[PDB]
Design a protein around this nucleic acid. Structure first.
Lengths: 83, 109, 97, 95, 95, 109, 83, 97
DNA sequence: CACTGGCCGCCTGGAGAATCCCGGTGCCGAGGCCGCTCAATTGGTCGTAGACAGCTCTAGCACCGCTTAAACGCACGTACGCGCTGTCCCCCGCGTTTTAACCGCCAAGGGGATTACTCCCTAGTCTCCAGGCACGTGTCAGATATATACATCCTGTCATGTAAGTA
DNA sequence: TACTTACATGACAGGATGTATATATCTGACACGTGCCTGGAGACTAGGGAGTAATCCCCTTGGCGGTTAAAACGCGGGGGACAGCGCGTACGTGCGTTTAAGCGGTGCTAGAGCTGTCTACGACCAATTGAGCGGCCTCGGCACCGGGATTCTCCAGGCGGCCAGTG
């Protein structure tokens, strides 16, 4: 039930493929740690917003509606999920 | 006893709704009142933008040798127009990926 | 000798294939479990539709990938082909956090 | 017994058939189009509301939304949307 | 006389005299305070309107407002704002 | 026989108006109806932010041995505080200038 | 009546003073014309918005209120002239 | 021999001086001439409030000092201290425009 | 091999100026007073939106069982960053000369702004009907799978520049 | 000294595989048909927002004379930029293994969401008043002015260490 350390579940080759989509030539071995940290910070902000949205609506399930609202708040509005 | 019902979009000669967009403005709380020509203008603007992006999507689908538009074709349509990137630079796309863009030193030799 | 390419040619193929690609780059199940891991820290017993996991996922490659084009701009500015962490926090700080 | 969901489905399908008769449309692309129409509509409506607030105008007019088209839409898209809107309100007024 | 151009003069001056009885205020700083109050009020009001639109709510009470505080103001300022806002609303219900 | 007109800000124990904030919310067209807790809560958060920033401004002014606050002191007050800097990242103070923040590599040795 | 060259009216030592406020120590010789050009671009973007506000207001005289509104539209909100 | 300060020492004194300072770094009347010129490009016979010229002055100085901070970061990124057009274009490209 | 004088790096002391520290003066900016006004407040009343209860049904949670793709880890290998240093060059510091910016002083009128008027318009509501949405299905573009062709990338092999022996 | 000849490096050729190029298959998501209703719409009405005439004044625009700091130009110089060589280095990629995500399957219920009640609650309007802003005046904190110190900066030649001559 309770989890500790699943941030390693975003694997190193997942970060490699992400950077390949971004057009990266060479990814240093140091890079994966702060990419995980930046993803930690960004998802923390987004789900903090989304949890605040859901707790405003007095629900217990995070919907994609509140997700795209949280992305619209941050100036990263996403197309394709019913916003 | 009553005039025949005629849609206001067909009165303006548009496909995009005068009525639905007008109602959504009235319930969207942007003002207390809205002028009559404002939803017609807004529907015309939305129809122009959608017509441009769907024309570019059909061009991309013909380039991709496909008949039905995919959000990859839509991302290819947006990012290959500079002024839409001036409109939609900060908006992220579902399943669109990235425009093909390999920089000059990134290419070999 | 067995077949083996020079360094970066396979990276060229990877970049070309994955910019042509539209399918998902990160695994689904550990991403959903990571969202759950972060969520229990903020509110316990929190559930997600699959579509909300999809939307957070699309936002994740969106934000990350955009940071990598910023990182490539920084890296080619420093006359290098290998990226360094300072490229990432430099791009983040110029971006305005 | 379900609840009706409002979308732009047949409208986008109509204009797509007008600009390209032989093409199709996917459901993911329709989600993209619904999000696009909603977002651009919201941007124009919000800036029109701000224009009405700044000039103490309590109503939304075609003139100020034309101002919003000048503001938001850059370059040739602005003047083409102006031509489209003026033509549209012209044949709407004549009707 | 001329028309009243409404401002946040005496309120900022009183909160200064509470927090620092001896120090003064310049007019440029005073305009900075007016634009500060306007900007923060606009941000909170816009996010409250957005939250009302999302939940299909015609009502803005303190609950949406503290939601918008927890969005916009980061962390320590947000929880402190909840603290004095909670004190204010409890004193308001107790009149 | 009407009761004495006593003020809502004093009912909150606050100085920022419930009245002006409530009026600007109603005429700002943000919702159809507005709960009574919303403008008093908003006055409370504005008063806390105002008290915090004029606290830092007064401390900076006494640091520069001056009695009257100036937007130089305000701008100094804003970017010593990290969460205020996060709040006001995109905002420019008029006549505020920039707080001294020199990168160490360009400093002499 | 007509003005053709006032972009050179933003003089090079004045650009130097601005860069001193930005913490710049060493400024290349090609920088000044580029700064003139990008300042020209930013003034173009601001003044098209401000004149659009003005012609909506049916005014001929540009006001600082429209300056504040055009700056806050671009995400560059300026304190000190509102109200 | 007349006294002469080393190159950069007066530059650091300029940085400390103008960084401590709050006053305007552009002459107000050529800026007014320039803004009337660019205004006449879009609408003829335009008139400016003096406060409007000052507000555009503060906004222009603000955008320029922010971009100059960004180019300072880009220059110290590139193992250099002299800012270059490539640094300025790096800043403009990263900032999303 | 030690002493010691000389030479060179370098390290310290000292000297001049630029802003700071300390007085000296005059001034209009803001803080307070006065007057006005308009706008918050109180009570009542009337309508109305969301909290709460209840039900239900559906997709998310939970558990189960195969399958190699992903992951990972090591190993060879090649390219990658970068420091030294040289080399070349380009812009800061300062002095001098010009010039228009700033001040400051005065005339004039364009339009920002305000008030009134009167009429254009626009939400609201009752009602009517008609096109998009829920729902159902059937059907061909695409997902998938199998057989070729070139790209292309790396690697071998002769072609050729070139250096050395010697007539 | 030029001619001949052997060697090392580059231009030319060729194979292998992976991704493109061609074609057969099935299948479900796209696309078409149907019932519906609710949401768009026509007419009338109540009412009120804004376009426009008039004006005024004030605040912006235009013009004129001087100072001197701002700007501009030149000399000099020191700092910066950057590329070649080398040097050590660190991921990229190939390939075998694991395992755990991925794909298909099943059961239950949390809670998401719709529906009925009702009530807390909020909005609107006449009166009223009281705090909050327009306008003015005062003095003293601060802008402007003047003189010496400390600090900053930069330079010479005093100091120490090292080296080589000499006894």
């Amino acid at each position: 039930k309770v989890l500790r350390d699943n941030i390693q579940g975003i694997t190193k080759p997942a970060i490699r493929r992400l950077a390949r989509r971004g057009g990266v030539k060479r990814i240093s071995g140091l890079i994966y740690e702060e990419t995980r940290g930046v993803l930690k910070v960004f998802l923390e902000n987004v789900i903090r917003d989304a949890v605040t949205y859901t707790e405003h609506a007095k629900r217990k399930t995070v919907t994609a509606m509140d997700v795209v609202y949280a992305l619209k708040r941050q100036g990263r509005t996403l197309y394709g999920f019913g916003g | 006893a009553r005039a025949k019902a005629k849609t206001r979009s067909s009165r303006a000669g548009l496909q995009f709704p005068v009525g639905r967009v007008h109602r959504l403005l009235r319930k969207g709380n942007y003002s207390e009142r809205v002028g009559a020509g404002a939803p017609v203008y807004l529907a015309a603007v939305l129809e122009y933008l959608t017509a441009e992006i769907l024309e570019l999507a059909g061009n991309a689908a013909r380039d991709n040798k496909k008949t039905r538009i995919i959000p990859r074709h839509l991302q290819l349509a947006i990012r290959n127009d500079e002024e839409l990137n001036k409109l939609l630079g900060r908006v992220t796309i579902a399943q669109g990926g990235v425009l093909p863009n390999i920089q000059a030193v990134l290419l070999p030799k | 000798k067995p077949h083996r390419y020079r360094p970066g040619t396979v990276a060229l193929r990877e970049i070309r294939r994955y910019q042509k690609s539209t399918e998902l780059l990160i695994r689904k199940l550990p991403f959903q479990r990571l969202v759950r891991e972060i969520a229990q820290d903020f509110k316990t017993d929190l559930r997600f539709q699959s579509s909300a996991v999809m939307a957070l996922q699309e936002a994740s490659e969106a934000y990350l990938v955009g940071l990598f084009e910023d990182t490539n701009l920084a890296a080619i500015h420093a006359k290098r082909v290998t990226i360094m962490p300072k490229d990432i926090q430099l791009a983040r700080r110029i971006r305005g956090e | 017994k379900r609840s009706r969901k409002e979308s732009y489905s047949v409208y986008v399908y109509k204009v797509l058939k007008q600009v390209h008769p032989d093409t199709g449309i996917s459901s993911k692309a329709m989600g993209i189009m619904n999000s696009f129409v909603n977002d651009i509509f919201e941007r124009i409506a919000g800036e029109a509301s701000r224009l009405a607030h700044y000039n103490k105008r309590s109503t939304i007019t075609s003139r100020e939304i034309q101002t919003a088209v000048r503001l938001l839409l850059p370059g040739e898209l602005a003047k083409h949307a102006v031509s489209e809107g003026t033509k549209a309100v012209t044949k709407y007024t004549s009707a």
